[PDB]
């Protein structure tokens, strides 16, 4: 997609589906009140994030697009697990083995390959820079 395709809401509302194949028009007050749509339905998809990454690249923002690609992978990870992985990356929280296990989980369960490499990289550097459990 190009800059001219942005914003999706104003140019291509029909490009936008949710994780449960609902559309933007499905989210009405009537459908919220009747529970025809719920919070489970209201979550951005990896396809939408990858379309926005395409627009970011067309806008000259390659790093923003890389962020969107990592986010696309992370849509498959549940909220509680997202919080667990974020906390494990904070200083002195994790053993190296725990970080490598998170990376293996990202790759083998959620196919979050970029995010898994990102965590493996942190693991290696947390050894060198002494930010693992027991280093404080």
């Amino acid at each position: 997609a190009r800059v001219s395709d942005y914003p999706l809401a104003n140019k291509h509302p029909e490009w936008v589906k949710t994780a449960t194949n609902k559309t933007l028009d499905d989210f009405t007050l009537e459908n919220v009140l009747s529970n025809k749509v719920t919070a489970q339905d209201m979550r951005i998809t990896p396809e939408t994030l990858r379309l926005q990454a395409s627009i970011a690249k067309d806008a000259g923002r390659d790093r923003l697009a890389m962020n969107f690609e990592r986010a696309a992978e992370l849509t498959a990870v549940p909220d509680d697990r997202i919080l667990e992985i974020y906390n494990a990356l904070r200083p002195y929280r994790s053993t190296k083995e725990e970080l490598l296990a998170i990376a293996d989980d990202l790759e083998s369960r959620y196919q979050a390959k970029i995010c898994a490499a990102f965590v493996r990289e942190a693991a290696t550097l947390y050894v060198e820079r002494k930010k693992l459990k027991g280093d404080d």
Binding site: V3, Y6, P7, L8, A9, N10, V16, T18, L24, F27, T28, L29, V32, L33, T38, A39, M42, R43, I44, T48, L49, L51, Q52, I55, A56, A59, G60, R61, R63, L64, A65, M66, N67, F68, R70, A71, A72, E73, L74, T75, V77, D79, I82, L83, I85, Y86, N87, L89, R90, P91, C115, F118, V119, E121, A122, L125, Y126, R129, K131
Partner: protein
């Protein structure tokens, strides 16, 4: 015998401010420090072996993150060889397009871009900023807080701030357990005052992400990064945890920026002998490297540190200019008290107000400063009329507008009634009619009845513990006499499904129209080009209270 001239001067508010002589060894120097490294880069087999004099074997986590993710290595050597004076000239030259500069700055090292901007005076920096600002239209962000965490007051103040022109609004907490109430009140009030205003609640990082996951915020900003490794560590993060956090927000369809700012490393005790501006450049490159679209900087909460030393307010403009020059949205501070002097705080604001930034202030206080839970802003609600007058004097769009008392009363009253309906529908501790009336006419929490804080924070934490989400708020409004506000709240939630407002500088204006640097690209090319205050927007700014019709 005293000089009565000097006795008069000794009483002046500015002489209550904190000034210090430069202290190189501990980083108490704003910019242009002799301990700062000379710009350099070496690359072998596509990987950085040296960064600003430092070999890769000595890299800390910040060096590694920037060297691996933050610099375009294909042109870094070429750009390093460029004359930093010529580059600074290009920055402020109206005839060098923004798109010609971004490929150069994104190939610079932190020391290199600091060397470039340090050749500039503040006039040159402002001339460059009006060009490098990512979004063509300037905007504004407000604080909405009070010392009681009173949710009725937050809703009313938020409606008024949205009505005055703020496109983002921010709350935080005196008592951390109150946060879900503060966030919901801010969101409801903001949508009442102008549907589309984006809202955030600034907390500890894990707490803020969870609150956003439940749908009670629109975005996050105070996602902090730091310029030395020991300070980053006491900030309870690393570049990798903060980069993962950034992508986590995006994976929930939530807009976010980082926050940094000169002087944090001094305040937190480990400047590593470096100037504030050099360390801040490291923070800006961490933000770029993480793929984060924007950054709140310009010292922000640590403004007492650069302001104490020579050229500190110039350094603050410089760090905003580095941010925009690296093609990041800049929410440019002007949000935190550093002086007792009205003259001095106005000079500090004008550095960003005059050229325009993506958010001229990243936290103008929309309440009187006694209620400001970020310990006071550089502007507050009692400055609203002055701010509109200066817009009119200078023909500068500062993002705000004059408003009528009758309109503000009505919008505050509707916001308080809407929140009353939410609390009733969600079985939260009641908002009384007396409180609705008080919030309508209040200046701040001095004018509000006392609430049962113990009961409020019990129910607020139950929102977290039971995972009560934003659709409960939509339903409560829809079933409590506010189907209009319910629809606007649903529309704000629907913005999280499209990814549109994840892009650089994105806000939501008018009839749900996303406005960002993608579709409002800054095209500055000198006089009579780029953003110009004109048309109906200029008519709005001219119409200040008290202008007599002389004929």
């Amino acid at each position: 015998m005293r000089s009565k001239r000097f006795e008069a001067l000794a009483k002046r508010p500015v002489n209550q401010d904190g000034f210090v002589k430069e202290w190189i060894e501990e980083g108490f120097i704003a910019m242009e420090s002799p301990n700062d490294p000379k710009p350099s880069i070496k690359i072998v087999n596509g990987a950085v072996t040296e960064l600003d004099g430092k070999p890769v074997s000595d890299f800390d986590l910040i060096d590694h993150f920037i060297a691996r993710y933050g610099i375009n290595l294909n042109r870094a050597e070429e750009v390093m060889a460029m004359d930093s004076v010529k580059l600074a000239n290009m920055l402020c030259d109206p005839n060098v397009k923004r798109s010609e500069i971004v490929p150069l700055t994104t190939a610079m090292t932190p020391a290199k871009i600091v060397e470039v901007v340090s050749h500039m005076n503040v006039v040159e920096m402002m001339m460059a900023m009006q060009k490098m600002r990512a979004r063509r239209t300037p905007s504004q962000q407000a604080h909405v807080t009070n010392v009681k965490d009173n949710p009725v007051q937050i809703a009313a103040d938020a409606a008024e701030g949205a009505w005055r022109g703020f496109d983002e609004q921010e709350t935080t907490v005196a008592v951390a357990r109150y946060a879900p109430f503060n966030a919901i009140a801010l969101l409801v009030g903001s949508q009442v005052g102008r549907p589309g205003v984006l809202t955030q609640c600034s907390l500890e990082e894990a707490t803020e992400l969870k609150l956003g996951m439940l749908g009670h915020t629109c975005y996050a900003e105070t996602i902090s990064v730091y310029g030395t490794e020991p300070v980053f560590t006491d900030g309870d993060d690393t570049p990798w945890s903060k980069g993962f956090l950034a992508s986590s927000y995006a994976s929930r369809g939530l807009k976010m920026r980082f926050t940094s700012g000169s002087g944090s490393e001094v305040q937190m005790g480990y400047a590593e002998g470096k100037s504030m501006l050099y360390l801040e450049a490291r923070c800006i490159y961490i933000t770029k490297a993480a793929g984060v679209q924007g950054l709140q900087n310009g010292s922000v909460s640590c403004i007492g540190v650069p302001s104490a030393v020579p050229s500190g307010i110039r350094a603050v403009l410089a760090e905003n200019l580095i941010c925009s020059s690296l093609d990041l949205e800049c929410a440019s501070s002007n949000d935190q008290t550093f002086t007792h002097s009205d003259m001095r705080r106005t000079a500090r604001l004008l550095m960003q107000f005059l050229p325009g930034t993506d958010f001229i202030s990243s936290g103008y206080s929309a309440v009187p400063n006694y209620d400001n839970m970020f310990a006071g802003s550089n502007e507050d609600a009692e400055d609203f009329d002055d701010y509109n007058v200066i817009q009119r004097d200078l023909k500068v769009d500062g993002g705000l507008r004059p408003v009528r008392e009758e309109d503000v009363i009505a919008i505050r009253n509707k916001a308080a009634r809407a929140l009353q309906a939410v609390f009733a529908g969600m079985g939260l501790p009641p908002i009384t009619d007396e409180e609705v009336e008080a919030a309508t006419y209040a200046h701040g929490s001095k004018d509000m009845p006392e609430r049962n804080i113990v009961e409020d924070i019990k129910f607020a934490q139950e929102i977290i513990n039971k995972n009560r989400n934003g659709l409960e708020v939509v339903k409560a409004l829809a079933q409590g006499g506010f189907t209009d506000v319910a629809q606007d709240m649903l529309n704000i939630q629907k913005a999280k499904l499209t990814g549109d407002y994840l892009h650089t500088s994105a806000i939501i204006v008018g009839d749900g129209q996303v406005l960002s640097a993608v579709n409002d690209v800054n095209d500055y090319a000198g006089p009579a080009t780029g953003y110009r205050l004109q048309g109906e927007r200029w008519e709005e700014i001219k119409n200040i209270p008290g202008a007599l019709d002389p004929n």
